[PDB]
Amino acid sequence: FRIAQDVVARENDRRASALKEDYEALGANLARRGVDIEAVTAKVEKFFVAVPSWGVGTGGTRFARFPGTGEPRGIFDKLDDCAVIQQLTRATPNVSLHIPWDKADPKELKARGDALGLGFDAMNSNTFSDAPGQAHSYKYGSLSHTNAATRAQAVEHNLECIEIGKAIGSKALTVWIGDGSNFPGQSNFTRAFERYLSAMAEIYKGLPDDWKLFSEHKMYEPAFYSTVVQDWGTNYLIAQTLGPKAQCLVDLGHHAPNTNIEMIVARLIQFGKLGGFHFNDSKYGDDDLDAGAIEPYRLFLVFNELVDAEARGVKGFHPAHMIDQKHNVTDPIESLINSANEIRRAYAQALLVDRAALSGYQEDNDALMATETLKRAYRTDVEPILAEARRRTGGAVDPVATYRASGYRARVAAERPASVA
Amino acid sequence: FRIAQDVVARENDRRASALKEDYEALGANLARRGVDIEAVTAKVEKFFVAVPSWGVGTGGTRFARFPGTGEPRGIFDKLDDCAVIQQLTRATPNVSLHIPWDKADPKELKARGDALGLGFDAMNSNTFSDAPGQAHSYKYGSLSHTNAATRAQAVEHNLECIEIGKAIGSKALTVWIGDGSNFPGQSNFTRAFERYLSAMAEIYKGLPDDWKLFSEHKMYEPAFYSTVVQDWGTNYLIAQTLGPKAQCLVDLGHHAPNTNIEMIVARLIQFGKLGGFHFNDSKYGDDDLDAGAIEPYRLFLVFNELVDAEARGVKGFHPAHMIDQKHNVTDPIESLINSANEIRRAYAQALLVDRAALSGYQEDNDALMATETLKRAYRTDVEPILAEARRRTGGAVDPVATYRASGYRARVAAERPASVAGGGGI
Amino acid sequence: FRIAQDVVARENDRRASALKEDYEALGANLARRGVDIEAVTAKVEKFFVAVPSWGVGTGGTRFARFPGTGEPRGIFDKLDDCAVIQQLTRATPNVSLHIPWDKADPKELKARGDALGLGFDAMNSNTFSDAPGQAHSYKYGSLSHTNAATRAQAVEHNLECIEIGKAIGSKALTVWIGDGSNFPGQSNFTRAFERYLSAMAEIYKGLPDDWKLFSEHKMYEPAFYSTVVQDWGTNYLIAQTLGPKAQCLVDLGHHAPNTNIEMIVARLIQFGKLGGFHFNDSKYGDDDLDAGAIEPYRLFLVFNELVDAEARGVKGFHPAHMIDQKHNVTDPIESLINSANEIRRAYAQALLVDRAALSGYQEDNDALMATETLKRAYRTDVEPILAEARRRTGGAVDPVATYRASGYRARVAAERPA
Amino acid sequence: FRIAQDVVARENDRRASALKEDYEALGANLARRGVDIEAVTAKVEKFFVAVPSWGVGTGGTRFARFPGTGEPRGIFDKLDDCAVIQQLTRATPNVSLHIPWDKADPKELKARGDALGLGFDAMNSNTFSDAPGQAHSYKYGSLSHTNAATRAQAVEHNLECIEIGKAIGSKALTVWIGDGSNFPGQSNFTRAFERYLSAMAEIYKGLPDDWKLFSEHKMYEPAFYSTVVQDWGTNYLIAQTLGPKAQCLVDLGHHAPNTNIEMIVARLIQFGKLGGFHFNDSKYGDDDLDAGAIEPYRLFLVFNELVDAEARGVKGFHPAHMIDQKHNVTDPIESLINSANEIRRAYAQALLVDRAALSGYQEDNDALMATETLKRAYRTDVEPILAEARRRTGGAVDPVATYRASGYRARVAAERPASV
Ligand SMILES: O=C(CO)[C@H](O)[C@H](O)[C@H](O)CO
Ligand SMILES: O=C(CO)[C@H](O)[C@H](O)[C@H](O)CO
Ligand SMILES: O=C(CO)[C@H](O)[C@H](O)[C@H](O)CO
Ligand SMILES: O=C(CO)[C@H](O)[C@H](O)[C@H](O)CO
Ligand SMILES: [Mn+2]
Ligand SMILES: [Mn+2]
Ligand SMILES: [Mn+2]
Ligand SMILES: [Mn+2]
Ligand SMILES: [Mn+2]
Ligand SMILES: [Mn+2]
Ligand SMILES: [Mn+2]
Ligand SMILES: [Mn+2]
């Protein structure tokens, strides 16, 4: 136990009275609305979202990085920190690894994971930066590079990621690359995309029978004029071209200003290509902020589409849920804790939507009552449900408060050497 | 001839000397660059783009409409005005009709067109507004409306557009609808799209063997929260689902801020679904401004993708080019003239790109020289080519100047009723 | 009483038990948080926002207008419909008039208002469209038009709006114009702005000393290349140049994509030029949608700045609140009702913010707890407070439910055949 | 000379015949339009834009940095490379320094600049990153940080930048900070701005009589929710509050999507607060791409406002021009060369605008001819003018071509060891 059980117990007991009052009051309100609070809590306690290993350490911008104390030394330290998030929120049992950042003996990774009660989600390849000893640089691209030898090198890297994933329990590979151009004319749009498709076809051939291959689109950054996998349209073309094992991953902050993201989610689901999500929030670009910290309603609307899929009886729909955030001005552990909480919050609210009533309002084109039906769910403070879900599963009623009371950050700050070069 | 031939001749002779000097200088410059100016002019002379019948009348916004003098009374006046654009620019031989706005006897329409030297491009259906005597309102949608009878009415309307088109020589139907929602929850995104696909399938069944069905995406307006055919991704799904006769139409001002539109064009070409274009310019939303008046380089970049495809000869590839603009503060005829000119300008510059050099710089990842290779073409003032193309094909060296010298606007102002200012409405 | 009192009473009694349960539950929760629910309800009951006369009728786009049944046929019908919004929500006692759309005998307008329990907020001038008999067209502008006679005509129109307002109790003039250009070069940015400033100075000269002059910025539409009063920066320059009675009006949907609007609010307050607001919501452009229907948190953050101004001790700050929306696919009355409700919702939530705790986290740079402090207020379902506030002041526990139960729309549909 | 004169001469001679033909042809075309090409060349040769010391090295993103060969390490190597840009384009005689990146003995810096034929433009302070041994971190801000000692440290740093500038010939200090918040509530907008204004007032007090203080606004990045100096509105409030020595700096890529930037320029000019520019191009955010590589017309429209201000003799008009770009996938020197070229290109085209005709069309509300009047100027290929201006003043007819023929990159690659 990364966090002493007596601390979790003490903090839960300190807040037990208030939780009881709030949960029971909410339960009565929901009952009057025809909703069984117990049914909602039972589903919420089962909702999981993968934590990014790269989000456990402090992030930075192209301008600067301002590390905090106790920054993780490597993947093992990162797993230890992820274990804290899982213990307290009980919503993050799986971790997303990024290669080569987290490269290590697969057996050892698996051993540490099992010891901490953690599993592993989709693997993430990295051909948007150069590792030492590469025969070819990814400066001008990777899977879509004009040089065949460079593309082959990128393909082999992705295959290595699959090998590592197979050994640790992963069942998918997420491919996000920076491939694109910064100047008009620099790249032939079609040829670059064709090169990418050929390279991905090779990676696809290396997928086990029960694995999925996720391609992640992004409008811009690092490329500032054009990006090969720039949007969901191109992403759909990728998934459809590659095969049934290939699907699309939607990262919330990767869309053009004002884009209706929840519709994109609906479209991909309709055509069976919604592989998963990379949750985060943003206001300007790919800000990678704590989920729901900027636009909580949008997060709810995305989950409204996810829950509607279940309501429409979509078969074989098991999208992967993952947090993809960077924490530049907060304790990464605290931000991941509250972000996972916010994701469960939006999910819980989506479960509250009276879809029988909503369907009627949609049929009759009663736009006002239709939107009010979504709002009645969204306006509901489901914090008591999230807190109770944590209580019953060994978590903390107030995760961040318990984390702070444990003195964990100071502890690891004394065990981990800060970077000096 | 809408414009007296002696006026066209007089205004051309007045500018012939300067044109000769500019054309010969550009010719020498292009020769030093290994380019034969005659080959470029020959292609420019053959580049055509359709003009919208609804574009020759003054447009407006939801706040007001400020009509000018000599506004067209109906489709016959509109065709007469479009004839001026074609006579002077020689780049707009075909007109795009919108139903029911341009409803009229098909035989009479065909007759006026043939007499004016105009043909007809894609028909445009209208299920984004209610017409008098209409049984079902399109307030909450049309092809994707929840009410079966309303969807059926919309389908029948589109089939009627096909029938009118068949009678006048049209070979395509462009479908743009406002269908969408203004509030979260109002529409079920998936069910609405399913209804749309089913309705379009019925329209597709009524398409002649040599016809095309174009669906046009738009991010927003009139719907302000969600739109059924919101972007090119959804548009691709539509075209792929319907069949080989269904393709996507790209309207420049219908994309999210900062979208790389030229890439969308390339992607659609790659997958054989680029049906055509709706040219215009914009800075904020679907502004429908004169093509190239705001971002001329973007227009060139779009044409760079078109010419690349036209270069490696993607056989059969014949996208339907059309101007889709609204003119709220200028003489519509003058704006359409200069807009058509700007479209030919971008095309001409794209033709100047050294494709071999560009390919070399792309393969070598010489980003700077690759971009400079495009700029060397774009920086070239091709006006002499555009002017000479017009001069030798019956047009005017300086179209707007000749239009003004003819006094055409004052002429039609005296032949048509005066207009009154009003509220919103296109 | 547009809505029968027995209907209001009936529908309130039907929901009285549930409200009592929810209100008491919330009261207990707030007490544990050191907040007295009664103090919040008292303030919510006094928060008012003006309703736009041009918003009670169905709106439309440049593509089409789809009227519903019982459409108001003029300003008098519009006042009758506005009376319904006020009676049920008790949050919209004042109506904003637009001239010449609402031209009618000022004396009669006032008489109708008094009879309906409605007052009048800021007057709105219209030099973005042409009226019959107008000597000069506003096609190429109004207050900033290159033609002196056209500018003078626009100034005179604004002065006429002031005279109408003085007769009905209005104390402010809001000026929003479409002036701008659709093409580079069409206008000389500086000269057009100089003309605008000179014309506005003439309006200011004729502004009563008990009135305020509000200028409203807008990034684009109807002008699609440049707009004279395009943003808050230009707006500030205008207000500062004209004088102390001139201030800036912030319409939520009039900003560039991703703009931090709440910061603009804070800036104008700091420099004493925040005249008021035009509430609405949007996702793409100036969509004019129901307030809070798209981005409810943003609305809360705007109110967080308004409440902080009070907490900071800002003096002489009494911004004019107005709803500026168009309703194209809903019953205008229902939309205005729920929009007024949403505005009070955001206000109530802003009042729940623990200012002392927030200040502490801000000074200590505890970003996570600072943001969580705002969320603790925002996540609170204040509907019971809004409902009780309405019940206590003569309104309805569930406004739209009561509205539908009354059959008012069907009633006016029958009274206003089309 | 960084580039051998015989190479410059040789590469000019091999392109002289074509230039002669193009310049004479453009001269005739302009003559038919009532314009004296020599008059345009005279103005173009006097247009200068400062090159950023931090621009000659290869840039990167938060994801990675892919250095090229012969990367300049330190201000001395950087000045050597900036010297090449000036020698070949003759449009960048001054360099913008950034402290502490370019820290070096002032006397030595000035001596090096003088020897290379380079001057120094506005100094740039850096309180958006932490330097080793720093007592207080700028993680949560600098000039507007909540902690007094931190603000004091930031103020002192800026005063140090002024001292360095005074020693080398600079006459201005540009202040761009990342100060802001990533979460609603994290900062109190007003209090943060008050702190910023008070701190800047202290910096203002340290300005020599003939110095200017430039504040640079930016919508976002590094702050992703709010930024203290977020737009030109706040920037204007800053300048007006601080005093006559304080003006606003407009960086093209620092505005919200679809913003009409040229109007912002016009507004600042009208109120005498246009301190200067940071030229670059962009398509999505603050991309820092080569000027004019994405939207050349927008660049021309900005220059149209600059030339109009001059035409009407606007009082107090004298903006400082600077390039602020990052080069991630090109040779930095080549990009700066062509960027400086694009800036002079837009300027030259703006000079071609028939101001009398334009004024007439504006007064008569002839929108179509007004816009065509701008287009007639913009459509003109002024490359011959730019090239001839360079040829007559010691520069290269085709700068990048001469640069590549010189083998300069390979030369410094041999003199400067790469990481690998
Ligand atoms: O979102 C992404 C890049 O912006 C990808 O998912 C990356 O792999 C991830 O963020 C780590 O950099
Ligand atoms: O672009 C469109 C609507 O914005 C469609 O093409 C219309 O049919 C056309 O613009 C006429 O309104
Ligand atoms: O917002 C506005 C125009 O976009 C102004 O407030 C108008 O006067 C109002 O909306 C009525 O059109
Ligand atoms: O533009 C800026 C930051 O985005 C400032 O001018 C910086 O000081 C400059 O770019 C160096 O990073
Ligand atoms: Mn991601
Ligand atoms: Mn990302
Ligand atoms: Mn169109
Ligand atoms: Mn359109
Ligand atoms: Mn408004
Ligand atoms: Mn508005
Ligand atoms: Mn800058
Ligand atoms: Mn910058």
Please explain how this structure is put together:
The structure is a homotetramer. Chain A has 421 residues and is an alpha/beta fold. Chain A has a single domain (1-421), classed as TIM Barrel. Helix content of chain A is 48%, strand content 9%. The first copy, chain A, is built from 16 helices and eleven strands. A six-stranded parallel sheet of chain A has the order 4-5-7-9-10-11. Chains in contact: A-B, A-C, A-D, B-C, B-D, C-D. Chains A and C meet through α2, α10, α11 and α13 of A and α1, α9, α10 and α12 of C. One manganese (II) ion (MN) binds at residues 218, 251, 254, 286 of chain D. Chain C: Pfam families: AP_endonuc_2 (PF01261). Chain C: Residues 92-287 form the Xylose isomerase-like TIM barrel domain. Chain C: Cu(2+) 1 binds at residues 216, 251, 278, 324.
Domains counted in the coordinates of chain A: how many?
Answer: 1
String of helices and strands of chain A: HHHEHEHEEHEEHEEHEHEHEHHHHHH
Write down the CATH class of chain A.
Answer: Alpha Beta
Count of β-strands of chain A: 11
**What strand line-up does the widest sheet of chain A have?**
4-5-7-9-10-11
CATH architecture annotation name of chain A: Alpha-Beta Barrel
Number of helices of chain A: 16
Q: Superfamily at the CATH H level of chain A?
A: Divalent-metal-dependent TIM barrel enzymes
Question: What is the CATH topology descriptor of chain A?
Answer: TIM Barrel
What is the quaternary state of this protein? homotetramer
Strand content of chain A: 5-15%
PDB class: isomerase, metal-binding protein
Keywords: TIM barrel, Isomerase
Assembly: tetrameric
Entry title: Crystal structure of Pseudomonas stutzeri L-rhamnose isomerase mutant S329K in complex with D-psicose
